[PDB]
């Protein structure tokens, strides 16, 4: 924010497939903020993957969820993964960044910080979704983006 | 293929019935020795491991690249309990997620000769959580298929979704061998 | 009882965090379960070495766990085959606390040593207590009549 | 040898199409699917009193008993044995079906409490005991409880009854109380249950906690029923008031067993009348007199002295006498059961004990904070 912008305009929204989707709401709901939310169906796993042009740069993210205990727990960042990427590889993978958000975090006044070292030249980013605040079967994100600046 | 298959064989009471000669634990039996030397040629590096499907799900034999292993343990099944069909996959889908190689693919052998005593909701909620780790389990409907047909139905319908042959619920209807069936069934192919 | 103090070595407390590490380094994880090698000296235990094993649990259900038992026996045969004094005697897990499935894993960990010993190793460092709390299984006959059960009944740790 | 069934199919002494679905399973051969339906035909509701279902032994089930369960091929005999009524030969029935089940403890075990229950009938006590002291012993190395636990509590209970062993007949029949569900068992059987246990429990030998008897669900039955007199007789128990305990005396005078026994039952409320006395009184001022055991147990004061030693001597109380100054010097009591009233005040004594650790552990570090480590 400070010479720094969010950037779901880069953000080509046709590179993004959010796995573990549910049909009741999908995932455009938590990228254009305006209520609403993102859930999970099969599994409280949601797996989340993001893509815009190669030059753009990470500071932080927004990850909003609710607050009856279906927002995000644990996530796991990756970024700039050939070939498709099923739960188990990121599960089974060492990601850039695995922050484990608190309450506070969740909370719509919430800004969550990323190591900004390691999120320099990123092609694409893949979320994982792991645990949610509780044992909500179904996993759901009111709100994300990405606050930073094209490289 | 290389895949890591775990048979989730059946020791319920209703394995002491004749209805498959000489008796469902006997077929079932030759049922393993078949399928399991069927995945040991399909590629050798491939991966069989017993799991029983009792009151209380009990892994007898983990994943390795042995067949004779599997049959001594499934000498000395016997006959006890209910069938736990709920807790059954995901103990066997629990081993599969720890495999000897990451790079074998997702495969779960379910020898269902009890009836399945939960809502569909539940099954099919499994189902969903298989299709997400791309696991697909190949299950035999002998034993009570006329009242497990329809529960059955909605799982490998679910976990094959609209497009793919993941996962067969080839259904033999009662006879002289389930094991003479399996040859011509997909799961062997 | 069978067991009256467990001495739990700092190699033990080391290997279980690195095992706690490792694992939860590639997924996270609510425990990380293996299994405790020693010897046994008159009725103080002596917890000297460990190897992790593979193990999960759902969250959901307690009954749902799996632990790789032949591995546990393969990796066994390693660690005789170096230290032929160090048999199993027990297991560990770095919960915070006891679980409702422990004394299930218990169970399976009593066939390999009858008298199995489950030490909570708690990774996270606690100011004041020893990070060990060794639990033996017994079977706690209760005089209101309800049926006899397996508890864990609780042996004094040392490291 | 099928012709029973199909002497059955058209002329049967239960419903045709009865046999007709036991005949279905018979050709599928769903063998353990059968038992059920032989369970729910055994426990017929038209012939069970007729002697037809006596040859459904030999000729239907015996045929098929090579593959059946042999916990499930037990209880199919007992309802089988049912119906014969000759004692002896009773035994040589389950004598050649204890032989045949032998893969299953469990089935070994219902088979030696059958024998047990009807050799009780028969009266032969000494040898009820040996089969008791064995079936107990391989009780215990099965793991858990299961259906068969039940039955030889109830037949434990059975044994200590009529030998006049109230002290093991209260253990045994809080055994079977926790192997089954109230909610099943017959409100007839519950209430009936209920006073044989209270009664055993008054009449025991060392049934000192009847806080954890108070409190059991089987004793809910009998809140309003015609012998609610014994549950205010346990509350006297329970309380050591031996003044009610002689007022409910035209209550409990009435009961066979307890008017033969009030003298044994006299010594056992004063003996709780004393724990009552320690219970009450705050440690500081535990030295009761000779005169206050006296009036509260209603006894001479020459016979306080004697009260003491009895619950010195079982474990009732710890403490001590002194004869000279006639005053008792309890140290200790018996645990007994609290309510939450109780329990909200031993909470509010730990916070004034919580409140001094803490006073302290501040003190030290404050005074010796150069010097700690």
């Given at each position: 924010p400070?010479?720094?912008?969010?950037?779901?305009?880069?953000?080509?929204?046709?590179?993004?497939?959010?796995?573990?989707?549910?049909?009741?709401?999908?995932?455009?709901?938590?990228?254009?903020?305006?209520?609403?939310?993102?859930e999970s169906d099969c599994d409280e796993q949601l797996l989340i993957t993001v893509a815009f042009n190669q030059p753009v740069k990470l500071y932080s993210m927004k990850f909003q969820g609710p607050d009856n205990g279906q927002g995000p727990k644990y996530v796991k960042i990756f970024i700039n993964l050939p070939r498709s990427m099923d739960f188990e590889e990121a599960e089974r993978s060492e990601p850039t960044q695995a922050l484990e958000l608190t309450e506070d975090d969740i909370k719509e006044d919430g800004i969550v910080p990323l190591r900004y070292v390691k999120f320099q030249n990123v092609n694409s980013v893949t979320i994982f979704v792991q645990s949610n605040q509780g044992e909500e079967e179904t996993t759901r994100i009111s709100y994300f983006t990405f606050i930073g600046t094209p490289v | 293929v290389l895949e890591s298959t775990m048979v989730c064989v059946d020791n319920s009471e209703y394995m002491r019935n004749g209805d498959f000669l000489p008796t469902r634990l006997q077929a079932q039996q030759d049922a393993v020795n078949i399928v399991c030397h069927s995945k040991t040629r399909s590629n050798p590096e491939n991966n069989v491991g017993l799991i029983t499907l009792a009151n209380d799900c009990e892994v007898l034999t983990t994943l390795t690249?042995?067949?004779?292993?599997?049959?001594?343990?499934?000498?000395?099944?016997?006959?006890?309990?209910?069938?736990?069909?709920?807790?059954?996959?995901?103990?066997?889908?629990?081993?599969?997620?720890?495999?000897?190689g990451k790079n074998h693919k997702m495969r779960i052998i379910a020898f269902v000769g009890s009836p399945v005593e939960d809502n569909e909701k539940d099954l099919v909620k499994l189902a969903k959580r298989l299709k997400k780790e791309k696991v697909n389990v190949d299950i035999i409907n002998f034993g009570e298929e006329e009242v497990n047909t329809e529960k059955l139905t909605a799982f490998v319908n679910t976990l094959n979704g609209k497009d793919g042959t993941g996962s067969h619920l080839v259904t033999v209807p009662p006879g002289p061998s389930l094991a003479d069936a399996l040859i011509s069934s997909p799961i062997l192919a | 009882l069978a067991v009256q103090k467990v001495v739990v070595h700092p190699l033990v407390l080391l290997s279980v965090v690195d095992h706690f590490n490792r694992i939860g380094?590639?997924?996270?994880?609510?425990?990380?379960?293996?299994?405790?090698?020693?010897?046994?000296?008159?009725?103080?235990?002596?917890?000297?070495?460990?190897?992790?094993?593979?193990?999960?649990?759902?969250?959901?259900?307690?009954?749902?766990?799996?632990?790789?038992?032949?591995?546990?026996?393969?990796?066994?045969?390693?660690?005789?085959?170096?230290?032929?004094?160090?048999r199993i005697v027990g297991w560990y897990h770095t919960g915070p606390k006891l679980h409702k499935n422990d004394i299930a894993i218990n169970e399976l960990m009593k066939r390999y040593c009858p008298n199995s010993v489950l030490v909570i190793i708690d990774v996270k460092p606690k100011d004041l207590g020893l990070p060990t709390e060794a639990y033996i299984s017994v079977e706690e006959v209760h005089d209101d009549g309800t049926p006899t059960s397996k508890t864990f009944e609780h042996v004094t740790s040392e490291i | 040898?099928?012709?029973?069934?199909?002497?059955?199919?058209?002329?049967?002494?239960?419903?045709?199409?009865?046999?007709?679905?036991?005949?279905?399973?018979?050709?599928?051969?769903?063998?353990?699917?059968?038992?059920?339906?032989?369970?729910?035909?055994?426990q017929d509701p038209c012939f069970a009193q007729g002697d037809g279902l006596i040859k459904l032994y030999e000729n239907f089930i015996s045929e098929f008993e090579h593959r059946v369960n042999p916990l499930s091929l037990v209880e199919i005999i007992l309802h089988v044995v049912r119906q014969m009524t000759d004692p002896n030969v009773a035994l040589t029935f389950?004598?050649?079906?204890?032989?045949?089940?032998?893969?299953?403890?469990?089935?070994?075990?219902?088979?030696?409490?059958?024998?047990?229950?009807?050799?009780?009938?028969?009266?032969?006590?000494?040898?009820?005991?040996?089969?008791?002291?064995?079936?107990?012993?391989?009780?215990?190395?099965?793991?858990?409880?299961?259906?068969?636990?039940?039955?030889?509590?109830?037949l434990?209970?059975?044994?200590?009854?009529?030998?006049?062993?109230?002290?093991?007949?209260?253990?045994?029949?809080?055994?079977?109380?926790?192997?089954?569900?109230?909610?099943?068992?017959?409100?007839?059987?519950?209430?009936?249950?209920?006073?044989?246990?209270?009664?055993?429990?008054?009449?025991?030998?060392?049934?000192?906690?009847?806080?954890?008897?108070?409190?059991?669900?089987?004793?809910?039955?009998?809140?309003n029923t015609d012998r609610q007199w014994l549950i205010d007789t346990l509350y006297a128990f329970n309380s050591g008031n031996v003044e009610r305990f002689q007022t409910l005396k035209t209550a409990w005078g009435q009961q066979p067993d307890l008017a033969a026994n009030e003298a044994q039952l006299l010594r056992k409320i004063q003996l709780l009348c004393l724990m009552e006395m320690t219970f009450t009184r705050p440690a500081n001022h535990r030295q009761l007199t000779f005169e206050e055991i006296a009036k509260s147990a209603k006894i001479t004061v020459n016979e306080v002295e004697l009260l003491v030693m009895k619950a010195l001597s079982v474990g009732l109380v710890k403490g001590s006498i002194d004869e000279v100054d006639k005053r008792v010097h309890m140290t200790w009591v018996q645990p007994r059961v609290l309510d939450l009233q109780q329990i909200k005040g031993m909470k509010d004594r730990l916070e004034f004990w919580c409140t001094d650790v803490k006073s302290m552990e501040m003190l030290v570090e404050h005074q010796a904070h150069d010097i700690l480590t």
């Amino acid at each position: 924010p400070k010479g720094y912008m969010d950037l779901m305009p880069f953000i080509n929204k046709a590179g993004c497939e959010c796995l573990n989707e549910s049909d009741e709401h999908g995932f455009d709901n938590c990228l254009r903020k305006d209520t609403t939310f993102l859930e999970s169906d099969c599994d409280e796993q949601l797996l989340i993957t993001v893509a815009f042009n190669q030059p753009v740069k990470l500071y932080s993210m927004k990850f909003q969820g609710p607050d009856n205990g279906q927002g995000p727990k644990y996530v796991k960042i990756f970024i700039n993964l050939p070939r498709s990427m099923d739960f188990e590889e990121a599960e089974r993978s060492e990601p850039t960044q695995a922050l484990e958000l608190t309450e506070d975090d969740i909370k719509e006044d919430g800004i969550v910080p990323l190591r900004y070292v390691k999120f320099q030249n990123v092609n694409s980013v893949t979320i994982f979704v792991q645990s949610n605040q509780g044992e909500e079967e179904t996993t759901r994100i009111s709100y994300f983006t990405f606050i930073g600046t094209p490289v | 293929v290389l895949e890591s298959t775990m048979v989730c064989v059946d020791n319920s009471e209703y394995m002491r019935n004749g209805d498959f000669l000489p008796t469902r634990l006997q077929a079932q039996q030759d049922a393993v020795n078949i399928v399991c030397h069927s995945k040991t040629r399909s590629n050798p590096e491939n991966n069989v491991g017993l799991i029983t499907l009792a009151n209380d799900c009990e892994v007898l034999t983990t994943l390795t690249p042995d067949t004779g292993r599997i049959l001594s343990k499934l000498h000395t099944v016997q006959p006890k309990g209910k069938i736990t069909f709920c807790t059954g996959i995901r103990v066997a889908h629990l081993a599969l997620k720890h495999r000897q190689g990451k790079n074998h693919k997702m495969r779960i052998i379910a020898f269902v000769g009890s009836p399945v005593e939960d809502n569909e909701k539940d099954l099919v909620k499994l189902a969903k959580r298989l299709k997400k780790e791309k696991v697909n389990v190949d299950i035999i409907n002998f034993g009570e298929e006329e009242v497990n047909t329809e529960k059955l139905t909605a799982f490998v319908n679910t976990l094959n979704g609209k497009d793919g042959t993941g996962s067969h619920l080839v259904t033999v209807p009662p006879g002289p061998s389930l094991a003479d069936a399996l040859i011509s069934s997909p799961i062997l192919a | 009882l069978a067991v009256q103090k467990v001495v739990v070595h700092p190699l033990v407390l080391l290997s279980v965090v690195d095992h706690f590490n490792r694992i939860g380094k590639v997924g996270n994880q609510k425990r990380v379960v293996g299994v405790l090698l020693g010897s046994w000296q008159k009725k103080v235990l002596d917890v000297s070495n460990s190897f992790a094993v593979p193990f999960d649990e759902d969250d959901k259900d307690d009954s749902v766990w799996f632990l790789d038992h032949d591995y546990l026996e393969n990796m066994y045969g390693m660690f005789k085959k170096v230290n032929a004094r160090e048999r199993i005697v027990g297991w560990y897990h770095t919960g915070p606390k006891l679980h409702k499935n422990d004394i299930a894993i218990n169970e399976l960990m009593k066939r390999y040593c009858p008298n199995s010993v489950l030490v909570i190793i708690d990774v996270k460092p606690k100011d004041l207590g020893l990070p060990t709390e060794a639990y033996i299984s017994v079977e706690e006959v209760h005089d209101d009549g309800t049926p006899t059960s397996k508890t864990f009944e609780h042996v004094t740790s040392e490291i | 040898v099928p012709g029973f069934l199909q002497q059955s199919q058209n002329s049967g002494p239960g419903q045709p199409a009865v046999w007709h679905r036991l005949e279905e399973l018979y050709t599928k051969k769903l063998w353990h699917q059968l038992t059920l339906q032989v369970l729910d035909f055994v426990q017929d509701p038209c012939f069970a009193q007729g002697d037809g279902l006596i040859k459904l032994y030999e000729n239907f089930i015996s045929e098929f008993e090579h593959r059946v369960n042999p916990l499930s091929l037990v209880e199919i005999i007992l309802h089988v044995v049912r119906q014969m009524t000759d004692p002896n030969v009773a035994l040589t029935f389950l004598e050649k079906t204890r032989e045949k089940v032998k893969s299953s403890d469990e089935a070994v075990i219902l088979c030696k409490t059958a024998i047990g229950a009807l050799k009780l009938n028969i009266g032969d006590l000494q040898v009820t005991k040996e089969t008791i002291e064995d079936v107990e012993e391989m009780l215990n190395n099965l793991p858990g409880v299961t259906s068969v636990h039940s039955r030889f509590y109830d037949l434990s209970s059975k044994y200590y009854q009529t030998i006049g062993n109230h002290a093991s007949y209260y253990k045994d029949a809080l055994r079977f109380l926790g192997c089954v569900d109230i909610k099943d068992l017959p409100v007839s059987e519950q209430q009936e249950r209920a006073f044989t246990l209270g009664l055993a429990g008054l009449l025991g030998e060392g049934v000192f906690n009847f806080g954890e008897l108070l409190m059991h669900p089987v004793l809910e039955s009998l809140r309003n029923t015609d012998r609610q007199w014994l549950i205010d007789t346990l509350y006297a128990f329970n309380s050591g008031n031996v003044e009610r305990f002689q007022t409910l005396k035209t209550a409990w005078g009435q009961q066979p067993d307890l008017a033969a026994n009030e003298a044994q039952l006299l010594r056992k409320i004063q003996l709780l009348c004393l724990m009552e006395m320690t219970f009450t009184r705050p440690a500081n001022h535990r030295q009761l007199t000779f005169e206050e055991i006296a009036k509260s147990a209603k006894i001479t004061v020459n016979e306080v002295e004697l009260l003491v030693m009895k619950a010195l001597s079982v474990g009732l109380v710890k403490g001590s006498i002194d004869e000279v100054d006639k005053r008792v010097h309890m140290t200790w009591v018996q645990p007994r059961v609290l309510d939450l009233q109780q329990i909200k005040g031993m909470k509010d004594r730990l916070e004034f004990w919580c409140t001094d650790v803490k006073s302290m552990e501040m003190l030290v570090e404050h005074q010796a904070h150069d010097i700690l480590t």
